[PDB]
Design an enzyme around this catalytic site. Sequence first.
Site, PDB file in Angstrom:
ATOM      1  N   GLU A  35       6.077  10.157   0.619  1.00 12.24           N
ATOM      2  CA  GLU A  35       5.380   9.138   1.390  1.00 12.24           C
ATOM      3  C   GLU A  35       3.904   9.492   1.556  1.00 12.24           C
ATOM      4  O   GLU A  35       3.045   8.607   1.492  1.00 12.24           O
ATOM      5  CB  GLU A  35       6.050   8.985   2.755  1.00 12.24           C
ATOM      6  CG  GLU A  35       7.460   8.341   2.741  1.00 12.24           C
ATOM      7  CD  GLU A  35       7.449   6.870   2.370  1.00 12.24           C
ATOM      8  OE1 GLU A  35       6.350   6.286   2.235  1.00 12.24           O
ATOM      9  OE2 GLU A  35       8.544   6.293   2.243  1.00 12.24           O
ATOM     10  N   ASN A  46       0.437  -2.270   2.988  1.00 11.84           N
ATOM     11  CA  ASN A  46       1.557  -2.939   2.335  1.00 11.84           C
ATOM     12  C   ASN A  46       1.158  -4.365   1.945  1.00 11.84           C
ATOM     13  O   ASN A  46       0.177  -4.916   2.453  1.00 11.84           O
ATOM     14  CB  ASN A  46       2.776  -3.001   3.255  1.00 11.84           C
ATOM     15  CG  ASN A  46       3.278  -1.650   3.648  1.00 11.84           C
ATOM     16  OD1 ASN A  46       3.590  -1.416   4.817  1.00 11.84           O
ATOM     17  ND2 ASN A  46       3.342  -0.733   2.693  1.00 11.84           N
ATOM     18  N   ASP A  48       2.429  -7.118   2.779  1.00 10.62           N
ATOM     19  CA  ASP A  48       2.498  -8.104   3.849  1.00 10.62           C
ATOM     20  C   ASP A  48       1.343  -7.978   4.826  1.00 10.62           C
ATOM     21  O   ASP A  48       1.312  -8.690   5.836  1.00 10.62           O
ATOM     22  CB  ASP A  48       3.851  -8.019   4.568  1.00 10.62           C
ATOM     23  CG  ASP A  48       4.135  -6.662   5.166  1.00 10.62           C
ATOM     24  OD1 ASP A  48       3.294  -5.745   5.065  1.00 10.62           O
ATOM     25  OD2 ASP A  48       5.247  -6.505   5.709  1.00 10.62           O
ATOM     26  N   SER A  50       0.717  -5.350   6.612  1.00  7.51           N
ATOM     27  CA  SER A  50       0.914  -4.224   7.500  1.00  7.51           C
ATOM     28  C   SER A  50       0.369  -2.973   6.824  1.00  7.51           C
ATOM     29  O   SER A  50      -0.015  -2.993   5.654  1.00  7.51           O
ATOM     30  CB  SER A  50       2.387  -4.042   7.851  1.00  7.51           C
ATOM     31  OG  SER A  50       3.155  -3.772   6.699  1.00  7.51           O
ATOM     32  N   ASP A  52       1.046   1.483   6.547  1.00  8.01           N
ATOM     33  CA  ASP A  52       1.863   2.657   6.815  1.00  8.01           C
ATOM     34  C   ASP A  52       0.949   3.830   7.147  1.00  8.01           C
ATOM     35  O   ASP A  52      -0.053   4.054   6.460  1.00  8.01           O
ATOM     36  CB  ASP A  52       2.747   3.056   5.624  1.00  8.01           C
ATOM     37  CG  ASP A  52       3.793   2.004   5.252  1.00  8.01           C
ATOM     38  OD1 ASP A  52       4.128   1.091   6.059  1.00  8.01           O
ATOM     39  OD2 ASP A  52       4.360   2.160   4.145  1.00  8.01           O
ATOM     40  N   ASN A  59       5.467   2.251   9.678  1.00  9.98           N
ATOM     41  CA  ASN A  59       4.902   0.970   9.280  1.00  9.98           C
ATOM     42  C   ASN A  59       4.502   0.177  10.523  1.00  9.98           C
ATOM     43  O   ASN A  59       5.272   0.106  11.484  1.00  9.98           O
ATOM     44  CB  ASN A  59       5.944   0.199   8.469  1.00  9.98           C
ATOM     45  CG  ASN A  59       5.400  -1.079   7.869  1.00  9.98           C
ATOM     46  OD1 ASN A  59       4.817  -1.911   8.542  1.00  9.98           O
ATOM     47  ND2 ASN A  59       5.645  -1.255   6.576  1.00  9.98           N
TER      48      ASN A  59
END
Length: 129
Positions: A35, A46, A48, A50, A52, A59
């Site tokens: 990650e 991301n 959408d 959002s 992380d 998230n």
Amino acid sequence: KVFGRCELAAAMKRHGLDNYRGYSLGNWVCAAKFESNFNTQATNRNTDGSTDYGILQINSRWWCNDGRTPGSRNLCNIPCSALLSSDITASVNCAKKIVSDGNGMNAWVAWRNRCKGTDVQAWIRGCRL
């Protein structure tokens, strides 16, 4: 800060992740590696809209507030910036919440695609018992 492998394993183990909800320490270290590359300052947007955050790429759609994710929930009740500290306490508490949410560590797409079912013990080879 960028953790060393065994440094991060010892920190995750001190905060009680070793076998949390049945996931051995190697699973958490592997997840962190893919990650964030062990980098507490990692941020990644991301599709959408959002973002992380942190060593476990938690998230903003559900878990932390960054003030720019419409429909955000902030279930860990923290600013996302707190997930970037050199102290992983906030990230680990929030990860405990996520992994208890019913779907286990499949919540971390990278864990499902790159750690799940692999020899995760290798990720703690050399850390101190």
